[PDB]
């Protein structure tokens, strides 16, 4: 019984590397360079970055 | 002053929570509770089903114009480092062992008998640093076996070392003993350390008198002389 | 009997920078932390506290007036105020330790039995009360007061005089009756009533403490010895200063012919100079106890 | 359900008194609040007076200042209203109503059956100048109203409720705020309103929209109600 | 024998999939990030605090509009609160004492808790009644409640306790998949942009991501030293950070899957609770538990200004859907919200 | 000496 | 005339600074340390000094309503000028400390960033107060009390028998003046007209344009300025400026119609430069976060 | 009057 389950377990923690392994991979530089752009096109519509005028607030007054 | 009249209703509104909140808060306040870790699946039935008379069951009563409740944790089948901390208001934490649970193989090892698990379960929880001014009361439950058991099988097979003779002061003092000396912080907390029966329910009135007990030493080190 | 007048100025500046000192320190450090230590026992320590600065405070004058033989170039208003501050602080004093020991009295004696009395004890309403109080018994000694300079001997002093309103044959009476009003308010039902719920709770104490323990023993013999010993010291500052002025003022009808009044009038002095022994003692007595004050300073 | 019904009756000479009550019926009586509306032959109506959740604040109108009465019991679900002395402007039916105010709190949504009751034989005003318009079945008509103050206020919200009455029967609650559309209704109707001065649309005319329309505002205190305006089916 | 073949196999498979991983790294992502300056030095002054409960607060998270907030509180009880005015919309009376997680509808209809009582409840809050009322008891896993998100009004995601995680339904109790790849118990699961994907995190110093629709592993990694007790998304779906009970602070990449910067400090030696991103994904906001809120960056590893406000250890942190507020909750009654 | 009740408010008193 | 008159500006005046100056202090001191600033580390001395400037005023107004026969004995009076006149010094100090602080923290650290921190800012508030304290010696080694002719009449003054020596004692009468007056007016007078100026120049040429929206800030802005000269100047004025015109009368010989115009309206000028403290609290907290917003932009 | 500065510490002073 628990000789015939424990193969269960082994082929089904197995059987999911072949499709972990078959994942396609990009080079680390390209997405450095989409997270460096993605941050400086949107570092100006950011409200906490850049202080906005008291006027904008609309908690404290 | 420049709210209209849904701002000052809402406002009337909010007041009437808070004080219902603060009335509620009021009524939940004076309530005692305890933890009931079995550290076995043997007697924590038992000690529950006297007193009355899925996951974490409650059980409550009134005894002598004071009321209580009781949380179980023993079946959770879970790690306790995570879910230990969330109970950090309770005042006493009650402990039970069975007494003729030694001389078995477990069932799960067949080399260690239960009173070794036991031991380290008690010597974690006792040195828990959540816990600081909690209180440990023993309750050891089926003590109808133990008369018997011992003139066939003597403790010496349990322990490495001497025991004494065979009767039954001597062990029980010497069960006592093991059981007392495994705590390092004896400056803030105590021990009860009773020995329950089946019948005579005088369980309640030892309750009564222990938690009184914690009580009046807690506030005592609260304020003033201690 | 003359070398002793130009000593007890120094004395009063000694009780002055011991019980100024303690008493300051003990101020900032209760309002250092004071916000987040909501304790039962903080509003009734800083009332006894600031009592005993107030109490304390204003000395110095009282003390060169004696060095400068009874002159008083310190206006008239200073006195004044003087006075009706030491006897408000006295009144709060009694009062404040009688509360403070019926708070401790009613949280121990029944835990849980009669706990729902808390909430008109424990709060500020009776440090309120205790004050007004402390006020109505006070003003008396403010309205029955007027200086003024006697014997044309060009020496002011601010002395009080019933002439306003008790008449030519009632200012003894009148004078008689305000002190005895005064005391016994001041010390009959109050120690009383300390020394009565104070002997209960030892009894509970050593009536639940009386089986054998390894560890309770010195924990229990702490707790008898604090509590006999600020017992005793409540006792012997607040007893002499009134049995001194209580026989006084009744034996005079019995008239000791010479020895035991001018025994009195030399003694007086030296009963008011004991009565510091409160102000010098009451802020170390409550605060290095406490644990908590102990971790606060370190 | 939140079924309401209203006790008390009959007729009386001036100077009399009688007893009004309103029963709850398993709607959270507890949280809710009253309110009670003046009914006269065919006009319009107006606002009588208001109850808090609580016993808290209560406000009266003007005319019947020194003469209704109103009180509340938590405990039965039921409210009290006593009459002194009746006057000869007095003869009017009620339709009593309930509210609660919160975030989302949409303010009149039920409404009772009324009774009668006959004796013997400042203020933003509504004027809603248009009466009777021939409108035919199929098409989109609007009416306009407007005020004589300008509503709007600094937090960002509009003040104005609209309802629809059938000829016998008691108004519902189409829209509590502009752009906001009260739950019962379809998707045939919009706000259409700015500045000072809002008007009301349909998309298509249909057999159950014959009825009158009124204006309300709720930035005062007190408040007052518009005119009539009768939609003939022709 | 049979067993040990197969565990050749698996090793000689890890052997390759790192071998995989180190090819794939060129250079550090600090050292091209070196060409822009910081930010500068930031802090805040608190703005407005609350005062309404009378315990320990662990759940606390916004709403939909970025207007209205709630919170679940150690006694049963759930606040609803308002940003504004300060005022209170309703208190919910709880049935299990005991809770760990609420949740908020986005369609402002429903809210969702649960704890210890191995159940989840769920109430609606608008009824034509006029009280709040309980709808149904959607139970049955094993394993106590850890974290419970929304998707939508009709279906819901539980994490687990025991060792899974599942998809279920709103109109039938039945659970329709279930997920069973983990090693141990689970702590928290966060949910993409896209509602596609999601990753949670067990207690087996690894985390994965899984498929809404498809149901079965698509990557898995490692590389901590004990349980990660907080995860987070990139506001694009590109990234998400991990966190470690060790204080360090940890971020992920899906494609690249490559390591990068790690956000350690020297002088800091006890953990974290909880961490999320601000708009932009310039700032990470990070709870501790010395009662302090050290600010980083995103892009750069320097330490900057910190906000410490709260006598007693705080627990959970998040931020409005507009940039306009945060709030962070802690074990003492207060509440607070900054700018 | 004969010296008529002054120092019952005369040296520090406070009666 | 004026012996009626001047008790109720005194009494008045005594009211306001005291309640001013208490509720400045109270609403100060409860913030906790984090929240406190140098500049809050000034104020709390200003409204400390003031507190104590204003507190001693009722001894002289019942020695004024009793026809100048003073009844407080000798330390009092002692004690009461020495206080006032050491927080007058700790004010002129302290508003001096807040104008540098004020100039410097706007556009020092961008052209040079050499300066001590604000942590010592309370050291420097505390070097302010010892030399304003040491300042005062000469004044109460000078409160000689005693009679003067034969009528009862008593008021502490100073007596000129200390120095001893006729050469030594103008000299050092002079020039006690003099320094204690150049040294407390002109270089504050100075230094506070130059960073005004500054400031309206740089506030002149900051808003040359017309957009939309920052044209009420400038008119606020600007008021502050004028509103901030116009009260230090009603305030600083009168003292020294009577002070000026009676040591010129001196050598001037002039006949005695200006000596008894200078001696009649000298109640009048001690009595309003008590607006200081009359008026610095609302003034102060009605224009704090313009102060502050501007410094750090 | 020829008095030789007497309000310089008597009138209301403070110099």
Not at chain 1, 23 to 40: G, H
Not at chain 3, 217 to 226: D, G, T
Not at chain 4, 62 to 91: A, W
Request: glycine share 6%.
């Amino acid at each position: 019984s628990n000789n015939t389950a424990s193969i269960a377990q082994a082929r089904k923690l197995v059987e999911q590397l072949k499709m972990e392994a078959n994942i396609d991979r990009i080079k680390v530089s390209k997405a450095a360079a989409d997270l460096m752009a993605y941050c400086e096109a949107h570092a100006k519509e950011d409200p906490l970055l850049t202080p906005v005028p008291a006027s904008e607030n609309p908690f404290r007054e | 002053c420049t709210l209209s009249a849904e701002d000052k209703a809402a406002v009337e509104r909010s007041k009437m929570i808070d004080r219902n909140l603060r009335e509620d808060g009021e009524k939940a306040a004076r309530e005692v509770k305890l933890l009931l870790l079995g550290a076995g699946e043997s007697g924590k039935s038992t000690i529950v089903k006297q007193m009355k008379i899925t996951g974490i069951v409650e059980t409550h009563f009134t005894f002598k114009d004071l009321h209580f409740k009781m949380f179980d944790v023993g079946g959770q089948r879970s790690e306790r480092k995570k879910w230990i901390h969330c109970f950090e208001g309770v005042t006493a934490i009650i402990f039970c062992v069975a007494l003729s649970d030694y001389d078995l193989v477990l069932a799960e090892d067949e080399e260690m008998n239960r009173m070794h698990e036991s031991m380290k379960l008690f010597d974690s929880i006792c040195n828990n640093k959540w816990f600081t001014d909690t209180s440990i009361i023993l309750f050891l439950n089926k003590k109808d076996l133990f008369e018997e058991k011992i003139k066939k099988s003597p403790l010496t097979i349990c322990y490495p070392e001497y025991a004494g003779s065979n009767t039954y002061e001597e062990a029980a003092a010497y069960i006592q003993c093991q059981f007392e000396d495994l705590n390092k912080r004896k400056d803030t907390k105590e021990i009860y350390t009773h020995f329950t029966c089946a019948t005579d329910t005088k369980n309640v009135q030892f309750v009564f008198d222990a938690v009184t007990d914690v009580i009046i030493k807690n506030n005592l080190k609260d304020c003033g002389l201690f | 009997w003359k070398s002793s007048g130009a000593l007890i100025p120094a004395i009063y500046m000694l009780v002055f920078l011991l019980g100024t000192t303690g008493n300051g320190l003990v101020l900032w450090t209760v309002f250092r932390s004071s916000r987040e230590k909501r304790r039962s026992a903080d509003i009734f320590i800083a009332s006894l506290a600031v009592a005993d600065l107030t109490f304390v405070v204003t000395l110095p004058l009282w003390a060169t007036y004696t060095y400068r033989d009874y002159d008083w170039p310190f206006g008239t208003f200073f006195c004044k105020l003087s006075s009706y501050l030491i006897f408000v602080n006295m009144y709060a004093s009694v009062f404040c330790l009688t509360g403070l020991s019926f708070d401790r009295y009613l949280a121990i004696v029944r835990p849980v039995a009669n706990a729902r009395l808390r909430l008109r004890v424990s709060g500020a309403v009776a440090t309120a009360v205790l004050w007004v109080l402390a006020a109505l018994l006070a003003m008396p000694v403010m309205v029955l007061r007027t200086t003024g300079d006697l014997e044309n001997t060009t020496k002011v002093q601010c002395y009080m005089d019933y002439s306003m309103v008790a008449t030519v044959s009632s200012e003894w009476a009148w004078e008689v009756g305000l002190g005895v009003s005064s005391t016994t308010v001041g010390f009959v039902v109050p120690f009383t009533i300390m020394l009565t719920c104070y002997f209960f709770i030892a009894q509970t104490i050593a009536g639940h403490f009386r089986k054998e323990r390894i560890e309770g023993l010195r924990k229990r013999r702490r707790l008898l010895s604090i509590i006999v010993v600020l017992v005793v010291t409540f006792a012997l500052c607040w007893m002499p200063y009134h049995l001194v002025k209580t026989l006084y003022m009744l034996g005079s009808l019995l008239h000791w012919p010479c020895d035991f009044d001018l025994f009195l009038m030399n003694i007086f002095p030296y009963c008011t100079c004991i009565s510091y022994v409160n102000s010098c003692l009451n802020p170390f007595l409550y605060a290095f106890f406490d644990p908590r004050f102990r971790q606060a300073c370190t | 359900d939140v079924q309401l019904v209203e006790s008390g009756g009959g007729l009386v000479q001036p100077g009399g008194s009688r007893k009004l009550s309103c029963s709850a019926s398993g709607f959270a009586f507890s949280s809710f609040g009253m309110h009670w509306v003046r009914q006269a032959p065919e006009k319009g109506l107006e606002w009588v007076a208001y109850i808090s959740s609580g016993s808290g604040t209560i406000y009266y109108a003007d005319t019947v200042k020194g003469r209704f009465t109103i009180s509340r019991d938590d405990p039965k679900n039921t409210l009290f209203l006593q009459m002194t002395s009746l006057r000869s402007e007095d003869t009017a039916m009620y339709y009593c109503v309930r509210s609660i105010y919160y975030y989302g709190s949409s303010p009149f949504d039920f409404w009772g059956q009324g009774t009668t009751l006959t004796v013997s034989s400042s203020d933003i005003v509504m004027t809603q100048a248009t009466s009777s318009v021939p409108v035919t079945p199929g098409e989109s008509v609007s009416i306009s109203c407007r005020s004589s103050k300008s509503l709007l206020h600094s937090n960002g919200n509009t003040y104005l409720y609209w309802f629809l009455q059938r000829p016998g029967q008691s108004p519902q609650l189409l829209i509590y705020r502009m752009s906001n559309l009260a739950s019962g209704v379809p998707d045939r109707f919009s706000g259409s309103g700015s500045g000072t001065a809002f008007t009301l649309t349909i998309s298509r005319l249909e057999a159950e929209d014959v009825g009158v329309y009124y204006c309300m505002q709720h930035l005062e205190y007190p408040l007052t109600f518009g005119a009539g305006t009768k939609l003939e089916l022709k | 024998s049979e067993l040990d073949q197969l565990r050749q196999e698996a090793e000689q498979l890890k052997n390759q999939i790192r071998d995989a991983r180190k090819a794939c790294a060129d250079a550090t992502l600090s050292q091209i990030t070196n060409n822009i300056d910081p930010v500068g030095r930031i802090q805040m002054r608190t703005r407005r605090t609350l005062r309404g409960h009378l315990a320990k607060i662990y759940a606390m998270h916004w709403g939909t509009d970025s207007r209205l907030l709630v919170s679940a509180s150690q006694d049963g009880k759930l606040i609803i609160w308002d940003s504004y005015t300060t005022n209170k919309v309703h208190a919910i009376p709880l049935r299990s004492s005991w809770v760990m997680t609420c949740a908020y509808a986005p369609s402002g209809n429903y809210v969702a808790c649960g704890g210890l009582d191995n159940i989840c409840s769920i109430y609606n809050l608008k009824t034509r009644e006029g009280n709040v009322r309980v709808s149904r008891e959607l139970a049955g896993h094993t394993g106590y409640l850890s974290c419970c998100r929304f998707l939508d009004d009709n279906q819901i995601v539980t994490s687990s306790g025991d060792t899974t995680c599942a998809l279920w339904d709103i109109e039938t109790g039945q659970q329709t998949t279930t997920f069973t790849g983990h090693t141990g118990d689970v702590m928290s699961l966060s949910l993409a942009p896209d509602t596609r994907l999601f990753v949670s995190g067990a207690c087996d110093a690894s985390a994965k991501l899984w498929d809404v629709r498809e149901g079965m592993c698509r990557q898995t990694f490692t590389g901590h030293e004990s349980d990660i007790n907080a995860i987070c998304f990139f506001p694009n779906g590109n990234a998400f950070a991990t966190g470690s009970d060790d204080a360090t602070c940890r971020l992920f990449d899906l494609r690249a899957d490559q390591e990068l910067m790690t956000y350690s400090h020297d002088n800091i030696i006890c953990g974290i609770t909880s961490v999320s991103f601000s708009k932009s994904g310039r700032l990470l906001l990070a709870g501790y538990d010395d009662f302090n809120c050290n600010v980083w960056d995103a892009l750069k590893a320097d330490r900057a200004g910190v906000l410490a406000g709260h006598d007693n250890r705080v627990s959970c942190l998040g931020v409005t859907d507009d940039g306009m507020a945060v709030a962070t909750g802690s074990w003492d009654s207060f509440l607070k919200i900054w700018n | 000496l004969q010296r008529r009740c002054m120092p019952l408010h005369s040296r520090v008193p406070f009666p």
